[PDB]
Design a protein around this ligand. Structure first.
Ligand SMILES: [Mg+2]
Ligand SMILES: [Mg+2]
Ligand SMILES: [Mg+2]
Ligand SMILES: [Mg+2]
Ligand SMILES: [Mg+2]
Ligand SMILES: [Mg+2]
Ligand SMILES: [Mg+2]
Ligand SMILES: [Mg+2]
Ligand SMILES: [Mg+2]
Ligand SMILES: [Mg+2]
Ligand SMILES: [Mg+2]
Ligand SMILES: [Mg+2]
Ligand SMILES: [Mg+2]
Ligand SMILES: [Mg+2]
Ligand SMILES: [Mg+2]
Ligand SMILES: [Mg+2]
Ligand SMILES: [Mg+2]
Ligand SMILES: [Mg+2]
Ligand SMILES: [Mg+2]
Ligand SMILES: [Mg+2]
Ligand SMILES: [Mg+2]
Ligand SMILES: [Mg+2]
Ligand SMILES: [Mg+2]
Ligand SMILES: [Mg+2]
Ligand SMILES: [Mg+2]
Ligand SMILES: [Mg+2]
Ligand SMILES: [Mg+2]
Ligand SMILES: [Mg+2]
Ligand SMILES: [Mg+2]
Ligand SMILES: [Mg+2]
Ligand SMILES: [Mg+2]
Ligand SMILES: [Mg+2]
Ligand SMILES: [Mg+2]
Ligand SMILES: [Mg+2]
Ligand SMILES: [Mg+2]
Ligand SMILES: [Mg+2]
Ligand SMILES: [Mg+2]
Ligand SMILES: [Mg+2]
Ligand SMILES: [Mg+2]
Ligand SMILES: [Mg+2]
Ligand SMILES: [Zn+2]
Ligand SMILES: [Zn+2]
Lengths: 76, 156, 85, 60, 106
RNA sequence: GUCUGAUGGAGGAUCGAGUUGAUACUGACGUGCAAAUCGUUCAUUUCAAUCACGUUUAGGGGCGAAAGACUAAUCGAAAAG
RNA sequence: GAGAACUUUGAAGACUGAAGUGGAGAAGGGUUUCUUGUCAACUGUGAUUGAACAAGAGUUAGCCGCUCCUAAGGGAUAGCUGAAAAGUGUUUAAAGGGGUCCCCGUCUCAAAAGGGAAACAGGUUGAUAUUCCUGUGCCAAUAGUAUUAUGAGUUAGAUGGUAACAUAUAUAUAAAUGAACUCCUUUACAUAGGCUUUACACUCGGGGUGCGUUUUCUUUGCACUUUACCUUUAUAACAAACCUUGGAAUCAAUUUACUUGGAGAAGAGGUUCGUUGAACUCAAUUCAAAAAUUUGUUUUGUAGCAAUAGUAAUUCGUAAUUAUCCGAAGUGGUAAGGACUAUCCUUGAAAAAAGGAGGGAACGGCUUUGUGCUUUGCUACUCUUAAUACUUGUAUGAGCGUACCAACAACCGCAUCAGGUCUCCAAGGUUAACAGCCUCUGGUUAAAUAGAAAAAAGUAGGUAAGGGAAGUCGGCAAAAUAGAUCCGUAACUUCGGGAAAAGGAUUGGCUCUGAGGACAUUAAUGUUAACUCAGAACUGAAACGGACAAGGGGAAUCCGACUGUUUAAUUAAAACAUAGCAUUGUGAAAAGCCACAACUGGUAUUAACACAAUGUGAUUUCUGCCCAGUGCUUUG
RNA sequence: UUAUCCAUUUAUAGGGAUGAAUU
């Protein structure tokens, strides 16, 4: 597993031939009420790539703007 | 197993490109980083290997050949040396005195090292314990302890 | 305070082996455990590592010597004879 | 440092007192010595300048 | 307290079979075998450790990065800097001495 | 040259569980739990120390810090035909 | 159930007491393992039980091992011996193999504890699990031809730093030329002593949740509050080595001990390795403070894995929700690493395999006459990683083991025998203590029998007035003494001892006093530990190492100097060994001592401070006379 | 000295005057 912090690099991986799925995890923050922390994970042939989003609106914008041939998985 | 120490000495191959290794009984005084010279024309100095027919009377030698080309058999135990005592008038013969006191005539082309064998004086410390002698012969051969004959039965 | 009158080093042998043997052991092991001058680097830091090998703690040169001392008179005499010539 | 290695002080308080005593004494002695030498050096300038003052008259 | 047991074939306390306990998310103690330390590579002249290179068992050395096994000088990761300095001085100065000794014949 | 305090950690050094053995009761048992066991007491623990697997030595021969000891419940000469 | 002291269930009273009848393996066994049935014989009493009897099942691997390497060693080849059977194993083999024609050079086996490519967590069965399921990783291999894409280099091989040294972050840090020949490193190594660091273990006080006691007391007693490999994991921090400046006696730095310095110390600034694996605002976010980088935070994240898993609770119908999973410290039991000091007439394996360097052979693409020495000609070329088509024999992961016991009835002892039999893990109280005694987790309450009675006699124990070895060959057996602290210790002595010599006093509980550290604000002020050691007053049927645990001592004589060894199963000693002392043989492949039928071997990887053969038996002080006899030895 | 025997080696130059070293 590997972590990414730069959204440009995250988007570059999302368009490569052997990326097969995305994982959307939704979770309430622990310190306080609702901060709906979100993590987005890409499944390539060799590693998972996880990016952590503190802003719900930004995460919501990024995920629907993904290519429509990636199978989507929701754990919560 | 041996009382004396060994020197590891490196010569440079003369019939090909490369280096070669020798193990030689070391004489008392040798040090790491020293150059020694072996041959019929080498100078007279401690650690060099010379034919015994080019050494003056009185020289102390060790690690001697009793025949030329033999690669050394006679004076080898720690603290031991020999003495050149006489030279033949027509060459061809050299007389020495062996550590046991015997006198012996050798071909004058045989080789030897100048100096005495190192680590001399090791029979002056009392062994003082049975275990010390157990450790001494543990690395030599199975010859210890010894039961004496008068304490056995006649069959054996 | 001074912990011992006579035996000094050989106090580790207790009462065994007889007094004269312990005396000879003391004479030998005073020499065996001393420090010697390294004529190459000038410091007095040469100590025995095995029954015939002596090594300097500073410059790390190895010299072949005697069994309980760095030099022996019989070799000193022969070397001096040759150097005189 | 060498005193403490030799087991002279069994405590921290005793060490503080001993060092204060030594420091005060060595300060006082040096203060005396410097005022003495300062007195000594003052007398030389007269001793040096009267020399040439007399030399300018008797010798040349 | 929880008690453990060997998981691999070796059940004796040798040098290649050393042990470290660890707590798992399931809540139990288990054993993992520990690799042996590796000796440092050494200078070919004075047998001192070479600065700038890693110490690995040869299987791990085989699959390591190229830059982690060398230094950039005339003898690289094989001879230390002091020894190289002395070698260069000996070479130049002794060639000079031979040159001056030769012309001294006349 | 000699006295006192501390530091330091030598020795086929001391006591003693475990381990390795076997001094005494001339105890139990002696148709035994057992063709050598059981109970208490005893010796030994940094070294000539203790254990495992592998490997060498074969019968008038081998091995023995030595008791004619041991060599598969067999030894002043094993076992099988 | 025909029939229950010894089948099953519940309730009691107890044991094992982490050095366990608790968990996991090796040797040996071979289906004893599981489910169902069932009692002729067996399970030394019963029996509905069973390891008995019967019928069916059960063992899943690129990552655990073997398989590969070499060791002490075994078997062979050439030759040589011998009637052969057999004995030796380079002793003159055109030896075998490997690097392109030349070099190197006998073969083969021997380790399931030595060397060694690579994996973790959760779940799952009547019976298997790092092997099956889910998810996330790693290692090795992968041919020729093209075509695309990634990246670097000259428009024949890149840069930075004064130096120690550093730099390729593409999905993926993949590429920084380098032939013959040569040198080095890793693999790779003993014991003892203390100091130090991290992880696991144990404990204390807060928060939350469930349970318990509750005549009285108890802001109370107990349980849970978790986080794996892998990402060169990034960074932080420590022992150490080294570099640049600097230039040391009034010597200085410094450790528990040490240990270092004009061959360049202290001070100041840097480089790397090892330990370890989210430490340090670590990363991403501008509220802002000079840009062609500084702050408390706007704020999040158990760094990714990861909560979606686990655990402890509260609800809703015959499969779903919901809430928690977080604040600060002590003790030192086990393991490993670090930097050191000391000891040896003792100096503590090898090989497969991998890496580093010195040296400088060879080197455009193109298509061309002549023949590799020509050209007229143009400017893309060389490496590197990945994917895709086609050509080739069918272009990823072979074979073997894996159930169960391991003694308590699955092993050896003729048996379901109080014997024997190799490794790893290891809680609380009292303590110097992994000792003894009691306890929590896990295990058990079974032993070729039970009930009643209870005298002789036995076996294993306990006590005894007055005397105290009068008993007996003989104090045999038993008794008396014992831990710590404070005092006090003779003769003799190889000066080291003797020595715990001999002897004397104290010890509970409760309430107090005194002495031993760290941190941060100013000689004052505050915040905080952890176990030890002294002194005093009270108190009790004069008791207090209260159980457990735990030397009897002294004056002399004989033998052996001491530690050590011995008659497995009647003798443990004064017997053997030992250091020390003395004597004898031998200068070598035509020598000393010894093996062999013969050829040939051992000591010997040796060389008189050596090898071989004897006697006596530490130290001290001594070692007298006899060479006629018997041996040995010298001359011709 | 040629039978016979021993020794050394990669059977590697006919007798005298603590850098590197190979195409
Ligand atoms: Mg006898
Ligand atoms: Mg490097
Ligand atoms: Mg002892
Ligand atoms: Mg007994
Ligand atoms: Mg009896
Ligand atoms: Mg007899
Ligand atoms: Mg029964
Ligand atoms: Mg009990
Ligand atoms: Mg109990
Ligand atoms: Mg116990
Ligand atoms: Mg069964
Ligand atoms: Mg059944
Ligand atoms: Mg019956
Ligand atoms: Mg059956
Ligand atoms: Mg493996
Ligand atoms: Mg071998
Ligand atoms: Mg093999
Ligand atoms: Mg192994
Ligand atoms: Mg099972
Ligand atoms: Mg983590
Ligand atoms: Mg299995
Ligand atoms: Mg199993
Ligand atoms: Mg049998
Ligand atoms: Mg049994
Ligand atoms: Mg039974
Ligand atoms: Mg009775
Ligand atoms: Mg009574
Ligand atoms: Mg009485
Ligand atoms: Mg009487
Ligand atoms: Mg009587
Ligand atoms: Mg008695
Ligand atoms: Mg006495
Ligand atoms: Mg004795
Ligand atoms: Mg004894
Ligand atoms: Mg007996
Ligand atoms: Mg007996
Ligand atoms: Mg005797
Ligand atoms: Mg003797
Ligand atoms: Mg005597
Ligand atoms: Mg006579
Ligand atoms: Zn020196
Ligand atoms: Zn060097």
């Amino acid at each position: 597993p590997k972590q990414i912090t730069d959204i440009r690099k995250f988007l570059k991986i999302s368009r490569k031939p052997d990326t097969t799925a995305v994982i959307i995890m939704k979770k309430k923050s622990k310190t306080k009420k609702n901060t709906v922390i979100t993590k987005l994970k890409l499944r390539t042939k060799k590693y998972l790539y996880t990016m952590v989003f503190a802003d719900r609106k930004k995460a919501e914008r990024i995920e629907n703007s993904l290519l429509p041939s990636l199978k989507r998985i929701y754990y919560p | 197993g041996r009382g004396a120490p060994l020197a590891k000495v490196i010569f440079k191959r003369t019939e090909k490109y490369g280096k070669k290794e020798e193990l030689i009984i070391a004489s008392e005084g040798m040090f790491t980083g020293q150059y020694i010279s072996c041959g019929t024309k080498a100078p007279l100095s401690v650690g060099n290997i010379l034919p015994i027919g080019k050494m003056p009377e009185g020289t102390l030698i060790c690690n001697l050949e009793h025949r030329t080309g033999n690669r050394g058999t006679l004076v080898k135990a720690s603290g031991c040396y020999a003495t050149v005592v006489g030279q033949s008038e027509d060459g061809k013969k050299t007389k020495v005195r062996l550590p046991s006191g015997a006198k012996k005539t050798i071909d004058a082309k045989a080789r030897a090292m100048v100096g005495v064998v190192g680590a001399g004086g090791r029979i002056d410390k009392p062994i003082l314990k049975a275990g010390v002698a157990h450790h001494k012969y543990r690395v030599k051969r199975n010859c210890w302890p010894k039961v004496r004959g008068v304490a056995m039965n006649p069959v054996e | 305070s001074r912990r011992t009158k006579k035996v000094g080093l050989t106090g580790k042998y207790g009462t065994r082996y007889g007094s004269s043997l312990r005396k000879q052991i003391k004479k030998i092991e005073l020499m065996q455990h001393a420090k010697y001058l390294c004529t190459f680097c000038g410091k007095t830091a040469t100590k025995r590592t095995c029954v015939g090998i002596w090594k300097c703690k500073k410059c790390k040169r190895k010299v072949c010597g005697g069994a309980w001392s760095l030099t022996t008179p019989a070799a000193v005499a022969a070397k001096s004879t040759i150097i005189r010539l | 440092y060498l005193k403490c290695k030799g087991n002279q002080f069994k405590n921290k308080r005793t060490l503080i007192e001993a060092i204060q005593r030594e420091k005060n004494e060595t300060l006082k002695k040096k203060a005396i010595a410097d005022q003495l030498e300062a007195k000594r050096l003052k007398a030389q300038v007269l001793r040096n300048k009267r020399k040439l003052k007399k030399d300018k008259e008797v010798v040349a | 307290a929880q008690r453990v047991h060997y998981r691999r074939h070796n059940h004796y306390n040798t040098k290649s079979n050393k042990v470290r306990p660890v707590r798992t998310p399931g809540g139990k103690l288990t054993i993992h075998v520990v690799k042996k330390k590796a000796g440092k590579p050494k200078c070919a002249d004075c047998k001192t450790a070479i600065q700038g290179v890693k110490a690995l068992r040869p299987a791990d050395n085989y699959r390591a990065r190229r830059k982690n096994r060398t230094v950039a000088r005339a003898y690289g990761g094989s001879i230390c800097a002091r020894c190289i300095r002395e070698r260069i001085m000996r070479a130049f100065l002794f060639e000079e001495q031979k040159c001056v000794r030769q012309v001294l014949k006349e």
